[PDB]
């Protein structure tokens, strides 16, 4: 009955049927995106109106369409033809990946480049990469992928060990034409293999690791109802899944006494971009919008018990559409479990003689995805004490190049001849806030140092200051780790027992933001990534910091256009967009396969409760 | 057999006997500090000499002494009379905590202050607080404690709920006189209790938490030999314990194939300071040097199974000296165990079809201490992938005051009438480096942004730079989160297979450093806390960033004095001192007992290995 339930195979089948009946899904059509829409703002609601948004591609060259259907009522709500040269191309189709290597294999320019390097075309893999927007005027309005080559010596060889530098091709995946083949000269193709399951590389496997057993004899402390509604240690939420964003959290709330108190209406990773910092023509165009261009949900791994998720695990198996509108299940794509998290609170008091210790635990909701060479785990945490946290785990294989003979300022050496171009992984968390309801505001809080003098004669005093962000034009904020800068989301109309507005404090990691020159294509296309914090007024159609269509789309949409409306955000329905990321200068230890590195953020209650919310936790 | 073994009860007994016999331990002498000295630098096979360092206090007013004895040979190596007005007072005696309350209880000024507030003197606890150095000339050379009052309504009451503001006393604990009683006026004593085990306050305890069972059916994967030598997953080290510093790690090394490779010679928390930022004269003097003034090792808790440490735990029970030279065991004061740490590495490769996943693990060495109101957990972590990490967990009860009517810029309100003065907790990690041996150097590494132009036509390039710190005068460094600043410790004479000096990279959290005015007493006595990273040349007697005798020292001791020697640190035996801390603006949620908050740092290998060091981890 819940409007936030996961999409079912039946719903997706029904969308297909509605589209078919309306003449919108003939044999030339492909679904590039399909997702359920969140219920509109309105508590005087339906029984249910389940609506789905669809991006429909046409393989014959006709204009694509954005369509919204109501599966409940069996109707097309709206359908509009898209001008992709203006508003952006549709996401890359999983079927268009194949096209590049296949087309190149019969291109005479490409064959000549491979022959120049004495490479067998049968052994040359081509990475099908998003093209972005640069100086190639003929690409405007066309679906283009750029190809980079890697040699695979045998079917189970890691081709990343053998990059073919000095060569790139551009391909029109609809007309099936190789538009350009650029060869800037031969580089040695690194010979050393990177096969991390090969005994000659691993050496004998450790026999020293004894088992660690994590079990729950009485089962988990959380409940799952209606498919995806979670209740755990006073927390309440709905776990959704979208093919673009991946796992999405809905209606995060906390049961404080008799009241269910909202905290966050919707939490997601609304975009993630991987800009490369190697100025070589072979890769200077390279920027992966994993979420916006590729759709990270689509590549969600099936998570194996014991391996990926250890302990008492409850799985969700979200359903997505394939390119033809048939449902496909991602079996065990989402892990849910609780884990011990050390000490929660502890004090040994001399005067009272009481020794008090309590243990902490956290609820985990996670999935793991794969985009070519690299892999990411997305983890959401709920803690006993009201803390909410997100963590990204970056791993996989590094994207490689040749390592230039006389060294490089933009590439590190991993192995003889083998380079790793510098890059970042930058995430945007979209937090549709609801601190005790929708009337919220944001303050920027800085530590304030004080000068020794009257009123502070010993020079020990320090303080803090808070600045309300009142309009969107003043709500684009940068980190300041030196002054302990955080952002507090409060409800000015809901006060704690001490008569202060209830709040939550956002703690960022203060990692560097986008490094690219402000005049670059990527700085315009990934404008969100250039600042740590954005606050907007809630609107239905403002979903991604990069807009609806990121593929081969210039600047013009996304957060910079939303912010321009300069709307009132002081005690209103607001959305926080937090930019955070990793800056990766790859090290030798990252090769042949990369150990997990992490980045994230957290929010802690800040006068939200009238006292510690974990006084009722037992010793046990 | 190892010179790094923990001190035994018998060794401490032998020290007592040596002192006694030399006439240095009469009935008016008190041991304020006692600890085993590390072995001197190298070199000659064995012929080992267990030496103990002792600070001897005299309760009749005579000059204290610093004494070094040899337990091995039963001799006194040296005994020096200390001039405490010059070089500082000895650490606070636990037996002196008692004295303050007792002396004040018969002081007429004190009793008048309590009578005015209608407080039963039998119910008034007095916190024995370190005095520091301020404007009071008569205190120079004297051994002073300052007292702040808290009301305890009954034996098991939390006195921290009932601070007595507007009142402070100064006492000479040797001559046993109250030197000052300052009453700046009456404040209401907050009436609400803060008894977190009172069902009235906690409410009904949760019945919703199901057990999490952590077991190792075949035992742990680490071995303990010689009492405190640990081998685990290629790591090697010795776990020491000092009454001042607490847990100390020795000889941290990694066995890389054939070689045992050193990384860190000695790791410790060599100071920790808690400066208060309330300019009220009642508290403006207040600065806890938990390590330097109080000695955090002596207040280490006994850790219970299931409560403090969960899973398969191996305990150490370190022995210390009491005030009279008797050995006292701290039963189960140190927890050692390994825990699962999620995914180590993961890649699902399209081209090879190989799906690869490995689990991560960390070795944990921890202890927990109590300093009056607040408590700290100290955690050292060793990871499979070579990473070394420290984490401090702060909890306990907040140190309280009145909340002024009208509010405050330096105090937050926890409960009606109840305040919590702003403060910091700032740590110093002393890392005696030994990256592949003692010939080390430190580089500051910043991200470098590049401008769009020739050689960077698309404006996507970014890079980094490294600056060698070559002498101590240039080795006092600041954080810069905005440019991703880290510090690399390398060995210029030990190169990896790519001909690069092996290295470890220090990742800081970039929290604010000491906030007090630069001209303040605390800024002078805790100068280490004003900068994030210091590098010194190793020397035997440079142990603490605040000097040997922190209590009532006038300023400038320790790191600023060391740095002043301006010694060569470029390819030399060097020591890294990292400052990191929490800036605490206490929240309503911190009351009546505080949920754990954390801070720390880590070091990651940086071209230390020739490839990932975890390729030989099995699939589990
Ligand atoms: O997005 C990276 C290119 C790629 C695509 C498919 C398999 C391996 C690598
Ligand atoms: O150092 C903090 C003051 C204190 C000392 C001993 C017991 C309770 C409180
Ligand atoms: Cu990376
Ligand atoms: Cu604190």
CA-CA distance, B511 to A342, in Å (whole number)?
23
* Closest residue by Cα to residue B140 from B524, B557, B556, B552: B552
Token pair recorded at residue A264: 């966050």
- Which residues pair with residue B129 across a beta bridge? B146
> Do A404 and A421 contact (CB within 8 A), yes or no?
no
Identify the three-state secondary structure at position B122.
helix
Residues with Cβ < 8 Å from A454, sequence gap 6 or more? none
Q: How far is CA A550 from CA A67, A132, A388, A545, B117, in A?
A: 17, 9, 29, 10, 69
* Element (DSSP H or E) covering residue A607: none
- Which residues pair with residue A491 across a beta bridge? A502
- Buried b or exposed e, range A242-280, using 16+ CB within 10 angstroms: bbbbbbbbbbbbbeeeeeebbbbbbbbbbbbbbbbbbbb
CA-CA distance, B387 to B362, in Å (whole number)?
9
> Do B419 and B590 contact (CB within 8 A), yes or no?
no
CA-CA distance, B86 to A404, in Å (whole number)?
60
Q: How far is CA B598 from CA A386, B217, B392, B509, in A?
A: 15, 31, 6, 11
| φ, ψ for residue B87, nearest 5 deg | -105, 5
Q: Which domains does chain A have, with CATH numbers?
A: 9-81 (3.10.450.40), 96-194 (3.10.450.40), 223-452+459-605 (2.70.98.20)
CA-CA distance, A82 to A422, in Å (whole number)?
36
Beta strand ranges found along A521-593 (DSSP E): 533-537, 574-584
CA-CA distance, B146 to B180, in Å (whole number)?
9
Which residues have beta carbons under 5 A from ligand 4 (an ion)? B 584
Pairing of strands A411-415, A423-433: unpaired
> Do B480 and A295 contact (CB within 8 A), yes or no?
no
CA-CA distance, B159 to A216, in Å (whole number)?
39
Annotation marks residue A374 as catalytic: yes
Token pair recorded at residue B95: 């037996």
Distance of CA A401 to the CA centre of its chain: 25
Measure the CA angle with vertex B532, ends B531 and B536; round to 5°.
85
Identify the three-state secondary structure at position A296.
helix
Q: How far is CA B191 from CA A316, A618, B371, B574, in A?
A: 50, 26, 24, 54
The three state secondary structure string of B84-116 is HHHHCCCCCCCHHHHHHHHHHCCCHHHHHHHHH
Token pair recorded at residue B602: 């880590």
Residue A149: CB atoms within 10 Å: 26
Judged by CB atoms closer than 8 Å, whether chains meet at A351 and B152 is answered as yes
Identify the three-state secondary structure at position B477.
strand
* Element (DSSP H or E) covering residue B536: strand B533-537
Who among B484, B593, B611 is closest to A345 (CB)? B593
Identify the three-state secondary structure at position A181.
strand
CA-CA distance, B559 to B545, in Å (whole number)?
5
Cis amide prior to B43 (ω within 30 degrees): yes
> Do A249 and A267 contact (CB within 8 A), yes or no?
yes
Identify the three-state secondary structure at position A110.
helix
Identify the three-state secondary structure at position A133.
coil
> Which chain A residues touch B605 with a CB distance below 8 Å?
587, 589
Q: What's the helix, strand, coil split of chain A in %, to 5?
A: 15, 45, 45
CB–CB contacts below 8 A, A to B: 451
Helices and strands: H and E segment counts in chain B: 7, 34
CA-CA distance, B192 to A175, in Å (whole number)?
77
Judged by CB atoms closer than 8 Å, whether chains meet at B221 and A202 is answered as no
Q: Where are the alpha helices (DSSP H) in B171-286?
A: 199-202
> Is the Cα dihedral B298, B301, B302, B308 positive or negative?
negative
CA-CA distance, B475 to B577, in Å (whole number)?
10
* Element (DSSP H or E) covering residue A431: strand A423-433
Residues with Cβ < 8 Å from B492, sequence gap 6 or more? B439, B441, B501, B571
Token pair recorded at residue A497: 């027992």
The three state secondary structure string of B286-302 is CEEEHHHHHCHHHHECC
> Do A362 and A339 contact (CB within 8 A), yes or no?
yes
Measure the CA angle with vertex B612, ends B605 and B489; round to 5°.
15
Give the resolution to one decimal, in Å. Answer: 1.9
Token pair recorded at residue A407: 């060294």
Residue B128: CB atoms within 10 Å: 21
Beta strand ranges found along A140-258 (DSSP E): 144-151, 167-172, 177-183, 213-215, 223-225, 229-232, 235-242, 246-256
CA-CA distance, B57 to B70, in Å (whole number)?
20
- Which residues pair with residue B224 across a beta bridge? B230
CA distance A463 to chain B (A): 5
CA-CA distance, A258 to B555, in Å (whole number)?
55
Who among B462, B587, B615 is closest to A201 (CB)? B615
Q: List the residue whose alpha carbon is closest to atom 8 of ligand 2.
A: B372
Residues with Cβ < 8 Å from A278, sequence gap 6 or more? A284, A286, A401, A408, A410, A411, A421, A422, B460, B461
> Do B614 and B345 contact (CB within 8 A), yes or no?
yes
> Do B31 and B54 contact (CB within 8 A), yes or no?
yes
Measure the CA angle with vertex B80, ends B79 and B83; round to 5°.
155
* Closest residue by Cα to residue B152 from A15, A310, A351: A351
Q: Where are the alpha helices (DSSP H) in A108-230?
A: 108-116, 199-202
Which ligand has the nearest atom to the CA of B581? 4
Q: For residue B353, report the distance from its CA to the centre of ligand 1, in Å.
A: 12
Q: What's the helix, strand, coil split of chain B in %, to 5?
A: 15, 45, 45
> Is the Cα dihedral B605, B609, B615, B618 positive or negative?
negative
Residue B136: CB atoms within 10 Å: 14
- Which residues pair with residue A55 across a beta bridge? A33, A66
Helices and strands: H and E segment counts in chain A: 7, 34
* Element (DSSP H or E) covering residue B618: none
Residue B215: CB atoms within 10 Å: 12
> Do A32 and A91 contact (CB within 8 A), yes or no?
yes
Identify the three-state secondary structure at position B161.
helix
- Buried b or exposed e, range B305-326, using 16+ CB within 10 angstroms: eebbbbbbbbbbebbbbbbebe
Q: Hunting for tokens 């600043």 — which residue is that?
A: B485
Judged by CB atoms closer than 8 Å, whether chains meet at A346 and B596 is answered as yes
Q: Nearest residue of A to residue B198 by CA position? A: A615
* Closest residue by Cα to residue A7 from A237, A297, A265: A297
Annotation marks residue B480 as catalytic: no
Cis amide prior to A592 (ω within 30 degrees): yes
Residues with Cβ < 8 Å from A42, sequence gap 6 or more? none
Q: What is the DSSP string of B138-154?
A: GGTTS-EEEEEEEE-SS
CA-CA distance, A129 to A431, in Å (whole number)?
30
Running DSSP on this structure, what letter comes out for residue B608? -
> Which chain B residues touch A209 with a CB distance below 8 Å?
221, 233, 361, 617-618, 620
Token pair recorded at residue B251: 């000889």
**Solving technique for this entry?**
X-ray
CA-CA distance, B96 to B305, in Å (whole number)?
32
Q: List the residue whose alpha carbon is closest to atom 6 of ligand 2.
A: B372
| φ, ψ for residue A281, nearest 5 deg | -55, -25
Running DSSP on this structure, what letter comes out for residue A540? T
CA-CA distance, A206 to B610, in Å (whole number)?
18
- Which residues pair with residue B271 across a beta bridge? B428
Contact residues, A window 277-296, toward B, CB-based 8 Å cutoff: 277-279, 284-285, 287
Q: How far is CA A168 from CA A179, B98, B351, in A?
A: 11, 78, 19
CA-CA distance, B487 to B444, in Å (whole number)?
5
A302 in contact with B, Cβ within 8 Å:
no
CA-CA distance, B390 to B599, in Å (whole number)?
8
CA-CA distance, B405 to B188, in Å (whole number)?
10
Identify the three-state secondary structure at position B344.
strand
* Closest residue by Cα to residue A143 from A218, A54, A32: A32
Residue A535: CB atoms within 10 Å: 27
Q: Where are the alpha helices (DSSP H) in A226-382?
A: none
> Is the Cα dihedral A296, A302, A305, A308 positive or negative?
negative
């Amino acid at each position: 009955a819940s409007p936030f339930r996961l999409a079912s195979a039946g719903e997706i089948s029904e969308v297909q049927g509605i589209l078919r009946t309306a003449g919108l899904l003939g044999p030339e059509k492909r679904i590039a995106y399909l997702g359920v829409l969140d219920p509109a703002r309105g508590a005087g609601s339906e029984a249910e109106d389940r609506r789905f948004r669809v991006f429909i591609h046409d393989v014959s060259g006709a204009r694509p369409q954005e369509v919204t259907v109501s599966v409940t009522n069996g109707t097309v709500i709206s359908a509009v033809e898209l001008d992709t040269a203006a508003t952006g191309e549709l996401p890359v189709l999983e079927e268009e990946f194949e096209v590049v290597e296949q087309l190149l294999a019969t291109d005479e320019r490409w064959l000549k480049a491979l022959a120049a390097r004495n490479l067998d075309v049968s052994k040359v893999r081509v990475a099908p990469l998003s093209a972005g927007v640069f100086e190639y005027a003929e690409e405007r309005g066309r679906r283009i992928l750029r190809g980079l080559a890697f040699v695979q010596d045998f079917p189970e060889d890691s081709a990343w060990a053998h990059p073919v530098d000095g060569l790139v091709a551009y391909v029109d995946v609809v007309s099936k034409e190789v538009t350009r083949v650029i060869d800037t000269g031969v580089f040695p193709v690194p010979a050393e293999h990177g096969n991390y399951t090969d005994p000659e590389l691993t050496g004998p496997l450790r026999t020293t690791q004894k088992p660690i057993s994590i079990t729950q004899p009485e089962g988990p402390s959380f409940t799952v109802t209606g498919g995806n509604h979670i209740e755990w240690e006073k927390w309440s939420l709905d776990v959704g899944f979208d093919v673009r964003e991946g796992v999405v959290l809905h209606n995060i709330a906390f049961r404080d006494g008799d009241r269910l108190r909202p905290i966050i209406n919707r939490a997601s990773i609304a975009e993630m971009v991987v800009p490369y910092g190697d100025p070589s023509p072979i890769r200077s165009w390279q920027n992966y919008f994993d979420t916006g261009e590729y759709l990270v949900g689509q590549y969600a791994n099936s998570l194996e018990l014991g391996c990926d998720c250890l302990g008492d695990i409850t799985y969700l198996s979200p359903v997505i559409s394939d390119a033809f509108g048939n449902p496909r299940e991602i079996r065990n794509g989402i892990c849910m479990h609780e884990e011990d998290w050390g000490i929660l609170a502890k004090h040994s008091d001399l005067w009272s003689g009481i020794n008090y210790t309590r243990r902490n635990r956290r609820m985990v909701i996670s999935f793991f995805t794969t985009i070519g060479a690299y892999d990411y785990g997305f983890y959401w945490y709920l803690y006993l004490d009201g803390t909410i946290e997100f963590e990204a785990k970056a791993t996989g294989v590094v994207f490689t190049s040749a390592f230039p003979e006389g060294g490089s300022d933009n590439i590190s050496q991993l192995a003889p001849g083998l380079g790793a171009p510098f890059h970042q992984h930058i995430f945007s968390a979209r937090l549709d806030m609801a601190i005790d309801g929708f009337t919220n505001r944001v303050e920027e809080e800085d530590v304030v140092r004080q000068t020794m003098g009257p009123g502070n004669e010993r020079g020990n005093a320090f303080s803090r200051k808070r600045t309300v962000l009142t309009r969107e034009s003043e709500a684009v904020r940068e980190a300041d780790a030196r002054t302990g800068r955080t952002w507090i989301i409060s409800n000015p109309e809901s006060k704690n027992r001490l008569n202060e507005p209830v709040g939550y404090k956002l703690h960022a990691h203060n990692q560097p933001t986008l490094l690219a020159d402000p005049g670059s294509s990527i700085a315009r296309r990934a404008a969100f990534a250039t600042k740590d914090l954005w606050v907007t007024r809630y609107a239905d159609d403002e979903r991604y910091p990069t807009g609806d269509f990121v593929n081969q789309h210039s600047g013009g949409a996304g957060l910079p256009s939303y912010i321009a409306q300069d709307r009132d955000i002081d005690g209103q329905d607001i959305v926080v967009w937090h930019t955070f990321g990793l800056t990766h200068f790859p090290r030798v230890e990252d090769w042949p396969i990369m150990p997990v590195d992490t980045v994230g953020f957290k929010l802690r209650p800040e006068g939200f409760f009238d006292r510690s919310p974990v006084l009722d936790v037992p010793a046990n």
